[PDB]
């Protein structure tokens, strides 16, 4: 009796995929979930996470294989890999240099999710939704905090979105830019943040128990969708804004210790098919990475430019880089102070 263990983030299959591949193949498949990259990074780097998959944003996985967690992928078992998009294949080599472990799976942005009549009701009718002013600008979240703030608690992405902010650079290397202004913005929103979470905003969006987020695109979709079909009256939009925003790319990778192997590229080949992939998209409101799928994908997610952006908005979109230990610190410093302000 085959077995497969997989560990992907929460709210990123559809929920018949895992399903479909078990009545297909006769393998059991163990499927559990996570929301931070900082949880699956700190399990690959403390021994075994006992997974035959995982699934890593790129940025996490550059550093994760001079570490010597992930496996090669055995292209010759993965034949129709010929079906990935090869610009998304060329900018996740950067973190992957010829693509050797990583399997682009979904790719969206980190900006703004709101709930448009309150933040208009509370910023008026031009609230400035297509800026990181709307969240970033501390007079402006005093007001917001009326009807609830979230941020993600993904410390290099806050931290890489307020830099750029600033007019910094976004992987910036200067300490200070961390320790003094990025430190000092972050303590003046604080107050103003009811929580930091990278899942359950989606719930707190749809139903109305907050009104503003730092958010994942199809994350913010999803919350979207969730309030329509409840109902509710419940209207959620998703913001890339102007300023720019943080792409990310995440990619499935097989531990160098998985212990079922064989099934494990037969989930990967599963999920390269076009038409299991965009049915995934359908669900969850993200863009996959696999070029033959788009036009199956639904029109909602297809031509929705929050999910699938024109090129003008990708040229303002940046990505995450591997800093220093010096960097790391006060990073990370700097964000302990932010959570517990
Ligand atoms: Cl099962
Ligand atoms: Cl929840």
Same mark, same amino acid.
């Given at each position: 009796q085959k077995t497969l263990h997989i560990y992907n983030w929460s709210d990123y299959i559809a929920p018949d995929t895992v399903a479909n591949f078990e009545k297909e193949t006769?393998?059991?498949?163990?499927?559990?979930?996570?929301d931070s990259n900082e949880v699956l990074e700190g399990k690959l780097m403390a021994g075994s996470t006992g997974f035959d998959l995982v699934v890593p944003s790129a940025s996490f996985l550059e550093r994760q294989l001079t570490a010597?967690?992930?496996?090669?992928?055995?292209?010759?078992?993965?034949?129709?890999?010929?079906?990935?998009?090869?610009?998304?294949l060329k900018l996740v080599a950067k973190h992957d240099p010829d693509n050797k472990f990583a399997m682009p799976y979904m790719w969206a942005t980190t900006g703004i999710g709101y709930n448009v009549d309150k933040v208009k009701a509370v910023l008026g009718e031009n609230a400035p939704v297509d800026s990181w002013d709307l969240i970033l600008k501390p007079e402006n979240l005093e007001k917001l905090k009326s009807c609830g703030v979230s941020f993600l608690d993904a410390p290099e992405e806050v931290f890489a979105?307020?830099?750029?902010?600033?007019?910094?650079? /976004?992987?910036?290397? @200067?300490?200070? &830019?961390?320790?003094?202004?990025?430190?000092?913005? #972050? !303590?003046?929103?604080?107050?103003?943040?009811?929580?930091?979470?990278?899942?359950?905003?989606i719930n707190d969006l749809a139903n109305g128990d907050i009104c503003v987020a730092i958010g994942w695109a199809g994350d913010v979709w999803q919350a979207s969708n969730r309030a329509k079909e409840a109902k509710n009256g419940v209207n959620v939009s998703?913001?890339?804004?102007?300023?720019?925003?943080?792409?990310?790319?995440?990619?499935?990778?097989? /531990?160098?210790?998985? @212990?079922?192997? &064989?099934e494990a590229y037969?989930?990967?080949?599963? #999920? !390269?098919?076009?038409?299991?992939?965009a049915h995934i998209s359908d669900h969850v409101f993200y863009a996959n990475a696999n070029k033959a799928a788009t036009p199956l994908v639904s029109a909602e997610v297809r031509e929705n430019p929050g999910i699938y952006p024109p090129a003008d908005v990708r040229a303002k979109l940046f990505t995450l880089k591997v800093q220093d230990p010096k960097i790391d610190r006060v990073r990370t410093r700097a964000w302990t102070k932010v959570k517990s302000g």
């Amino acid at each position: 009796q085959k077995t497969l263990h997989i560990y992907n983030w929460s709210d990123y299959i559809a929920p018949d995929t895992v399903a479909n591949f078990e009545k297909e193949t006769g393998i059991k498949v163990v499927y559990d979930v996570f929301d931070s990259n900082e949880v699956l990074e700190g399990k690959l780097m403390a021994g075994s996470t006992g997974f035959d998959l995982v699934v890593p944003s790129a940025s996490f996985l550059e550093r994760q294989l001079t570490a010597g967690v992930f496996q090669p992928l055995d292209k010759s078992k993965l034949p129709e890999w010929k079906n990935l998009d090869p610009e998304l294949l060329k900018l996740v080599a950067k973190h992957d240099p010829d693509n050797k472990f990583a399997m682009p799976y979904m790719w969206a942005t980190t900006g703004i999710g709101y709930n448009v009549d309150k933040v208009k009701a509370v910023l008026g009718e031009n609230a400035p939704v297509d800026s990181w002013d709307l969240i970033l600008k501390p007079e402006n979240l005093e007001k917001l905090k009326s009807c609830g703030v979230s941020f993600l608690d993904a410390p290099e992405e806050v931290f890489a979105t307020v830099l750029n902010y600033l007019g910094k650079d /976004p992987n910036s290397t @200067k300490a200070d &830019d961390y320790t003094g202004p990025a430190t000092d913005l #972050l !303590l003046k929103l604080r107050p103003n943040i009811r929580y930091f979470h990278s899942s359950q905003y989606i719930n707190d969006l749809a139903n109305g128990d907050i009104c503003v987020a730092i958010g994942w695109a199809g994350d913010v979709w999803q919350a979207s969708n969730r309030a329509k079909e409840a109902k509710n009256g419940v209207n959620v939009s998703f913001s890339i804004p102007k300023e720019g925003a943080m792409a990310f790319f995440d990619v499935f990778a097989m /531990p160098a210790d998985a @212990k079922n192997k &064989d099934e494990a590229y037969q989930f990967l080949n599963y #999920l !390269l098919r076009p038409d299991v992939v965009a049915h995934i998209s359908d669900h969850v409101f993200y863009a996959n990475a696999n070029k033959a799928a788009t036009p199956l994908v639904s029109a909602e997610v297809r031509e929705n430019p929050g999910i699938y952006p024109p090129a003008d908005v990708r040229a303002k979109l940046f990505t995450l880089k591997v800093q220093d230990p010096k960097i790391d610190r006060v990073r990370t410093r700097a964000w302990t102070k932010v959570k517990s302000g």
